[PDB]
Amino acid sequence: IKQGIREVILCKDQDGKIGLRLKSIDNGIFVQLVQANSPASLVGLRFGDQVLQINGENCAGWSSDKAHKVLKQAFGEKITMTIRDRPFERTITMHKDSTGHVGFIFKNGKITSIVKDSSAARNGLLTEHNICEINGQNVIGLKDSQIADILSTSGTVVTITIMPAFIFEHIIKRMAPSIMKSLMDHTIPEV
């Protein structure tokens, strides 16, 4: 999680699309969905990023509908956004034990227990936290089995980005786990 604000400049694609769904949370505006192969993924927008401004207008107090409307009426050539990096999330670095375990159980992406004497215990991994990202890869909406696969295939050093479950549940409200699995960008970013 970067320690502050950044400018991103977007162009609408062929189809007039940027590849975002935004959600009003606590009078801010947050990234709910980043579509694979979109302008939003190419410029590096992430699930949970806060949108401070759009074209130098403050988003504070906007409905999810008004943010979507402002974006639909922007001269798509150049759209500026001021972004605060994933403010609800934290990153935890863990090390697999020789059995390949970091040391937790999770269900529907939510950590439910920490195994005694594990890297997860030593590193203060918390329960009631949704997994947002593993080693920089968005995993939101993947089956638990695909998440376990990713942790299997990772090197010994595992980075996990988590979010308090109450906040996670507030953001993904009104995005059933088809688009979440289907259309949430799960790729490694392009260079």
From Swiss-Prot:
GO MF annotations in UniProt: cytoskeletal anchor activity; frizzled binding; identical protein binding; interleukin-5 receptor binding; phosphatidylinositol-4,5-bisphosphate binding; protein heterodimerization activity; protein sequestering activity; syndecan binding
Keyword Phosphoprotein: yes
Cellular location(s): Cell junction, Focal adhesion; Cell junction, Adherens junction; Cell membrane; Endoplasmic reticulum membrane
One GO CC annotation: nucleoplasm
Domain of life: Eukaryota
Modification comment: Phosphorylated on tyrosine residues.
Main location: other
GO biological process, one term: actin cytoskeleton organization
KW rRNA processing (keyword) present: no
Swiss-Prot/TrEMBL induction comment: By IFNG/IFN-gamma in melanoma cells.
Tissues where the protein occurs: Expressed in lung cancers, including adenocarcinoma, squamous cell carcinoma and small-cell carcinoma (at protein level). Widely expressed. Expressed in fetal kidney, liver, lung and brain. In adult highest expression in heart and placenta.
Keywords carried by this UniProt record: Acetylation, Cell junction, Cell membrane, Cytoplasm, Cytoskeleton, Endoplasmic reticulum, Lipid-binding, Membrane, Nucleus, Phosphoprotein, Repeat, Secreted
Membrane topology: Peripheral membrane protein
Domain (PDZ): residue spans on this chain: 7-86, 91-166
Residues noted as binding a 1,2-diacyl-sn-glycero-3-phospho-(1D-myo-inositol-4,5-bisphosphate) in the record, renumbered to the chain: 108, 143-144
Function: Multifunctional adapter protein involved in diverse array of functions including trafficking of transmembrane proteins, neuro and immunomodulation, exosome biogenesis, and tumorigenesis. Positively regulates TGFB1-mediated SMAD2/3 activation and TGFB1-induced epithelial-to-mesenchymal transition (EMT) and cell migration in various cell types. May increase TGFB1 signaling by enhancing cell-surface expression of TGFR1 by preventing the interaction between TGFR1 and CAV1 and subsequent CAV1-dependent internalization and degradation of TGFR1.
Subunit structure as annotated in this protein's UniProt entry: Monomer and homodimer. Interacts with SDC1, SDC2, SDC3, SDC4, NRXN2, EPHA7, EPHB1, NF2 isoform 1, TGFA and IL5RA. Interacts with NFASC and PTPRJ. Interacts with SDCBP2. Interacts with PDCD6IP. Forms a complex with PDCD6IP and SDC2. Interacts (via C-terminus) with TGFBR1. Binds to FZD7; this interaction is increased by inositol trisphosphate (IP3). Interacts with SMO.
Protein name: Syntenin-1
Gene source species: Homo sapiens
Covered residues, full protein: 108 to 298 of 298
